Amino acid sequence: AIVKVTDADFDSKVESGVQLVDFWATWCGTSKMIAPVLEELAADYEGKADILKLDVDENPSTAAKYEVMSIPTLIVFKDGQPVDKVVGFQPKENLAEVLDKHL
1-103: which CATH number, 3.10.20.30, 1.20.1560.10, 3.40.30.10, 3.90.980.10? Predict the structure, then answer.
């Protein structure tokens, strides 16, 4: 459902259209809390937007490149450029609202 992405293939994965990138970490309970919400979101947009995951401990470059300081952080990409940032826990509704704002 949700495709993993790393420093190595970020640029090729996030390059065209809309992607919602979830910057998470295994030591953060809040990331674990939104995981299921994103799996359901990814299904609702099974062809409009891609939902990716990036583990910040294994990919500090990318996390650093977009000034990701606190997590979870969710960034919406439009044709390779970040256009929206969401910090903390958010219910499916609030996230869907943000995606529709760019589709």
Answer: 3.40.30.10
- CA angle 47/50/54 to nearest 5° reads 165
CB-facing half-sphere around the CA of 67: CA atoms within 13 A:
4
Q: Is the dihedral of CA 61, 67, 70, 3 positive or negative?
A: negative
Strands (E), 1-103: 3-4, 18-24, 50-55, 73-78, 81-87
| Lookup: tokens for 10 | 């970020």
Nearest partner of 76 among 58, 63, 92, 95, judged by Cα: 95
Domain ranges of the chain: 1-103
Experimental method reported for this structure: X-ray
Residues 6+ apart with CB under 8 A from 82: 66, 75, 76
